[PDB]
Every structure is written in structure tokens, then in C-alpha cells.
């Protein structure tokens, strides 16, 4: 039928960035008309693809990844970036082909007194490879003494809360992000405009 973009975009819940959600889009026609011609997006940037041309193309599969970050971090959802999000939460490859879409969701995802449901990974020994998803909750060992599952000095829970409050500045407000990857394989195409 029609590719179920609404299930992704108009979803009541969104994932924390460290456990970002991925929907696989196959065997349907995708019209990007609603997305490119909606005035409700803070960010709509495409790489290796032009948005108008999207309805004139065909891919093996499309991937829709979804999560929440803060505004100042949306710039890290792009090829070749660095920072806590790009390094330890969600990493785009340098040859990325697809589009990043983001919109302010302060009305949905912020709570007076702090919304502590949305998390980000703060500690990680090494960088993420592109499209890697790390859901570990092992205690982070910042020294040479083993932590053994208990928090303490040099032994920290690797995930931290954003604590979105509606009073935050726009750079610290939650933004919902959808990353569309258009994958080109040597196989029959199943997603078209």
C-alpha cells in the first residue's frame, strides 16, 4: 500500500537516543510530498539525494530511525560529526545517503520538575560505528578498579537523563528526530514514489 510513515512520525512515544528505534520500510510506495511540504519541521536536510527528486526514485529498502535529543545536538545527526550523541549514541556514516528530519516537541516531551524518561549514553570507552546500537547498562569503569555492578567513585551508570523542562532554552528543549536511510542493494527494488 502506502508506506506507513505516519506510524513513525505521528507516534505517541519516541525512543531514547541510546536505544533509538528502527522501522524497516519495504514493499510500498512512498510519497515524500507530505514530508517535504509540511511547515512543521525544524530540520529537513538531505544527503546524496534531493528531496523533490525523491518521488522519482526507487530503493531496495528504506530505514526510519527515530529518537529524541536536545536541539543543540541535532547538528550531530549528520555525516562526519563528533560529540556525545554522534560518538556514543547514534552515528551516521560518512557516505550517508538519506534525510534527517527534526522538529521541536517541547509540548510533548517536557515535564515540569523534569522529564527523566529520555536518556543518553554519557560514558563509553570507544566511539560507535555507523548505525550501531548500544543498550548496555554495565557500570562504567573510569579507573583501574573493577566496579562489579555497584556505583561509586570511578564507577558510573553510563546512561544519564536529559531532564527536559518546559522552561529550558530552545537549545535544551527536546527535538524528535527521524533519519531516513535509502539503501541501494543489488536486489529488486520494493520502495518507490
Amino acid at each position: 500500500n502506502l508506506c506507513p510513515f505516519g506510524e513513525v512520525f505521528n507516534a505517541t512515544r519516541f525512543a531514547s537516543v541510546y536505544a533509538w528505534n528502527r522501522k524497516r520500510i519495504s514493499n510500498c510506495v512512498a510519497d515524500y510530498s507530505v514530508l517535504y511540504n509540511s511547515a512543521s519541521f525544524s530540520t529537513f536536510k538531505c544527503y546524496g539525494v534531493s528531496p523533490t527528486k525523491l518521488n522519482d526514485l526507487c530503493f531496495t529498502n528504506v530505514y526510519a530511525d527515530s529518537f529524541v535529543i536536545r536541539g543543540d545536538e541535532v547538528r550531530q545527526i549528520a555525516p562526519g560529526q563528533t560529540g556525545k550523541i554522534a560518538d556514543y549514541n547514534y552515528k551516521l556514516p560518512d557516505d550517508f545517503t538519506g534525510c534527517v528530519i527534526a522538529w521541536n516537541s517541547n509540548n510533548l516531551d517536557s515535564k515540569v520538575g523534569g522529564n527523566y524518561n529520555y536518556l543518553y549514553r554519557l560514558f563509553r570507552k570507544s566511539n560507535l560505528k555507523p548505525f550501531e546500537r548500544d543498550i548496555s547498562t554495565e557500570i562504567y569503569q573510569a579507573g583501574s578498579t573493577p566496579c562489579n555492578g555497584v556505583e561509586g567513585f570511578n564507577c558510573y551508570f553510563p546512561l544519564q537523563s536529559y531532564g527536559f523542562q518546559p522552561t529550558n532554552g530552545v537549545g535544551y528543549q527536546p527535538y524528535r528526530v527521524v533519519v531516513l536511510s535509502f539503501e541501494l542493494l543489488h536486489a529488486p527494488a520494493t520502495v518507490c514514489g
Partner: antibody
Amino acid sequence: QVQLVETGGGLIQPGGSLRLSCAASGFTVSSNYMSWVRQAPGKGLEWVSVIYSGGSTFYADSVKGRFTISRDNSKNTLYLQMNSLRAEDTAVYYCARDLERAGGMDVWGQGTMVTVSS
Amino acid sequence: EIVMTQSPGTLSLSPGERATLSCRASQSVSSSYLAWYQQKPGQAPRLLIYGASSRATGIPDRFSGSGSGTDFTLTISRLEPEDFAVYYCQQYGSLYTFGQGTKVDIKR
């Protein structure tokens, strides 16, 4: 047990070069957010540079293209390579460990003095 | 560039009085990313408060912190002779910037 000790400070001329070292004990440099913060005589604290556990580095605008932060995991040591020094780089340079929301900058060295003069 | 401005520049109090230091960020920042540090002459800074109100290890109970949005406050409930020093606020949510500092004076 927890100690940061800075070395390498001294007197140098404008346009000169110097490499500061910060030896750590009680935690692993490569496992942490490690920063240099400087304080000019009589003024406040100015962050200089940071290196993430994963290798990413960031710099203050006032040192971009002149300073480079790095580390040696074998000697558990952080380094600041400073090129094209100017008179305003004259300051005490501290090396510090940051925990962000998990506890701020909780460990500081005692600093090393760098004087840049003609 | 987030600019932190502290007030007042100098605070003059006696041992046993209450100290109230204010810090204003030029842009709204989460209380998650606010810290307070103490510095005495010739010594490195020492972390007092992280995450706007969490005391660091070893920090006595007279030190408290609060605030949100652009305004934050460090409070020393009853001042000890050790408490006469300079105090800096810091945001660490977008790299790091400090305030110019507030000095606590011995009043007379």
C-alpha cells in the same frame, strides 16, 4: 590516591612552542573526559581544550589552530601542545577530569605556570 | 557563546552570617548543567556543587545550590572562617564557560 600533576610550564617567547604534561593517578586518562583550564594572573577560569574517552577533541576559539590536546595511555598522561604562543597565553594551566551530570569537574591538578614574553 | 554573569562582585559578611551568590546565564540552560566551584589564593579550584543542587563528595551541609532557567543561587547557610574565598559558577552543557567570580569578604 587521586592526583593530577602538571609539568612543562616555563618562560617562552611569542611565536614559541611548549608542551605541557599532566600525569594522573587514581583514574585512567583515556577512560575520561579530560580538560585543560587556564587562569591568567588575577583573572577567572577559561576552559581551553577537552578530549573524550573515544578520541574526539574540542577547543576554545582563542586557541583553535594553535593548541592540540592529546594523551598517552601507557604513561596515563595528558598533553597540551601549544604553538604560536602569544603574551595572553600567560597563565596557570590546570588539568581536570569532568563527569558532566555524573559529578562535574571533580579532580583538578595544582597547575603549572606559563609565561610568554619578548 | 553562553556568558555567565555573577553578582555581586564582592560580598562582605561575618562568620556565622548567610551568604547568597547569584549567577545569571545569558541563555536559558538546564539546571542539569550548572556547577559551583570554590577557589582560595594559590590553590586550584575545588568543586562544590554539580547539577545545580547536588553537593560533591566531602562538601559540608552549609553549602546548598538551587535555581533554573537563567538564574541560579549558591547559598552558604552559616559562614565559617574557611568559607572566605572566591566562587565561580560554570555551565557544562555547551563546552564549558565560567563566570567572573564572586569574592566573599570579611566584613568590618
